[PDB]
């Protein structure tokens with residue numbers, strides 16, 4: 436008889452509940468540890484699942500090693516398992532597909548298979564505001580991107596270039612980090628200067644003179660507050676009721692309120708031209724179904740676009756300065772190009788002349804290769820996905836992770852990948868180009884194939900639309916840097932390792948360089 440055994444289950448249960456709370460919590464801690472270990476061993480026996488990276492701590496998973504050094508994590512996993520593997524990340528299962536076929540599998544995934552907004556809305560929506568980017572169906576995002584692109588034309592860039600140039604010179608003249616009329620040499624932290632230069636140039640051109648003017652006041656602190664809400668922390672804790680979450684929410688309201696004030700002021704004055712992105716969205720933000728974006732949604736879209744372009748661009752210009760700091764040969768080569776294209780500096784820089792500066796553009800291109808701002812891009816898996824030429828199935832509820840920035844740094848696709856070499860792009864200085872067929876998801880024709888090992892701007896429906904603005908901004912900025920200054924490292928200093936813990940792969944600061952005026956007695960005009 437096992438009825439007696441059934442009695443002892445009950446008895447055993449009663450004795451369990453009567454254990455000392457020392458052993459009890461000890462069991463509360465050890466019982467999931469064992470189950471988690473057991474479950475993994477069972478999981479590895481499945482062959483319709485990609486290999487899963489082993490981990491000791493339940494829920495946490497490989498979060499530590501991935502959070503701190505994701506490319507080293509990927510390389511070890513790649514050696515062990517190949518290009519497709521999964522790992523647990525703070526409650527989630529992430530399936531990584533490394534390499535060009537991984538680019539295809541994720542970036543060109545069917546709309547019904549994966550969702551970007553399901554992965555990102557929790558973070559971005561509190562920062563940008565409601566109704567836009569990832570707080571809306573994909574079809575709305577497609578048209579929002581179309582609206583923004585309408586202010587990102589060649590004719591717009593022709594107008595932006597002198598505005599951006601003005602801001603760079605103003606910064607050289609007025610910022611305490613330079614003061615070129617008073618000082619001929621100095622030391623700067625590029626992680627201090629580049630965010631400032633980036634927001635000043637982007638505000639002036641995209642938002643206009645009024646909004647740029649606000650950055651000279653205490654209002655600028657709000658952008659810094661809003662900046663704090665844009666952090667990997669908010670992927671896990673999007674809202675816990677403490678301080679920087681409040682200042683974030685406050686900043687969003689305060690900043691969007693300022694934009695709406697200008698929007699409403701321009702319309703009631705009929706003061707709507709073709710100056711900036713605000714004018715453009717005011718004249719062009721009606722969806723195809725006839726629903727118009729509200730002034731709040733327009734304001735929120737402005738925040739998201741400026742914020743995203745802020746962090747990517749500021750990281751890159753910082754990396755460009757840092758790589759050139761130990762390459763006076765490259766500075767010299769870029770300077771000669773400036774002298775030739777701008778006729779010894781007597782030609783005023785224009786958007787057209789920027790396109791005649793291949794080495795400068797190649798420098799941006801090579802920096803984008805070595806320092807892709809976003810080391811990982813996510814999608815939540817919505818339907819079971821079969822991985823082609825495998826028996827692998829990625830079940831709904833998983834997340835897929837694609838990492839073009841990892842491939843950027845592989846010798847197989849870029850010889851001597853860890854060497855900064857702008858000449859690997861000789862006769863290939865364009866920001867990007869489709870090697871064949873195109874397709875339109877609602878914001879213009881783009882590459883249908885996403886198999887390039889070089890994808891600084893992603894691909895597919897979620898592809899970047901700011902690439903030409905970024906090159907314009909970076910180009911003007913670096914053209915002026917090169918013509919005005921020489922710079923180098925403090926003794927014993929070199930290019931710093933990336934900080935993979937922030938939203939973008941910015942350099943580990945403080946990252947200091949020493950600048951010197953090429954023309955010590957050159958003065959920058961204007962009142963101050």
Ligand code: HEM
Nearest residue numbers: 740744747748812891892893896897898899900901904905
């Ligand atoms: C060096 C500068 C930049 C780089 C490397 C970069 C990179 C990227 C990448 C990789 C994506 C794809 C994201 C994904 O697939 O989840 C993306 C998307 C996007 N970016 Fe950029 N970006 C840059 C600058 C900018 C600028 C200046 C703007 C706007 C003025 C901008 C606006 C956008 C927008 C609207 C998307 C669409 C996201 C989506 O559809 O889900 N970016 N960018």
Ligand SMILES: OC(Cn1cncn1)(Cn1cncn1)c1ccc(F)cc1F
Nearest residue numbers: 568739740742743744747809811899938
């Ligand atoms: O793709 C981002 C969001 N993101 C994803 N991983 C980290 N941040 C970044 N970004 C890309 N280009 C510029 N910023 C984005 C996309 C659109 C957008 F409006 C804001 C925004 F942050």
